[PDB]
Amino acid sequence: GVSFSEVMGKQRDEKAYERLQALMSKIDDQGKLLSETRTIEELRKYKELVKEFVGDAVELGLRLEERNRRGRTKIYKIVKEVDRKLLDLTDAVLAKEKKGLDILNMVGEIKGLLINIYA
Numbered sequence: 838g839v840s841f842s843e844v845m846g847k848q849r850d851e852k853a854y855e856r857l858q859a860l861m862s863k864i865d866d867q868g869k870l871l872s873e874t875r876t877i878e879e880l881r882k883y884k885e886l887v888k889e890f891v892g893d894a895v896e897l898g899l900r901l902e903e904r905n906r907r908g909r910t911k912i913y914k915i916v917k918e919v920d921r922k923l924l925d926l927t928d929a930v931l932a933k934e935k936k937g938l939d940i941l942n943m944v945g946e947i948k949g950l951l952i953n954i955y956a
Contacts (some may be wrong), residue, residue: 846904850897850900850901850904853893853896853897854897854955855956856893857890857893857894857897857939859892860886860889860893861890861948861951861952863886864883864886864887864890864948864951865919865948867879867882867883867886868883868941868944868945868947868948869941870882870883870884871940871944872937872938872940872941872944873931873937875935875937875940876930877930877931878927879927880927880930883936883944884923884927884942887919887923887947887951890951890954891919891951891954892956893915894951894954895912895916895954895955897954897955897956898912898955898956901955901956907956913952915950915954916954918950919947919950919951919954920951922946922947923944923947924941926940926943926947929943932954
């Protein structure tokens with residue numbers, strides 16, 4: 838006896854999740870590329886993807902809260918830690934010596950924070 842707008846909402850959440858999964862695939866590939874190349878050009882592309890994910894994941898996260906709950910506080914705290922990490926990554930890429938495995942770790946941390954944004 839399920840209502841239409843209930844189903845529509847669930848499908849909306851599902852598609853948004855799927856878009857996030859597709860973006861995370863790109864993010865994984867670019868984070869790997871950046872770990873290998875270690876150029877500001879690859880950093881630029883990485884952070885433009887990550888920044889796009891954050892936007893879409895917060896939007897999904899806040900809607901899912903209104904279906905149960907972790908809190909806006911938590912979601913925002915994760916976003917703030919992502920920002921912190923991104924700036925620390927920029928630094929590590931800009932610094933003179935530059936190790937691919939440490940860079941890999943840094944992006945794997947970010948991804949760990951990223952997937953926790955929405956739920």
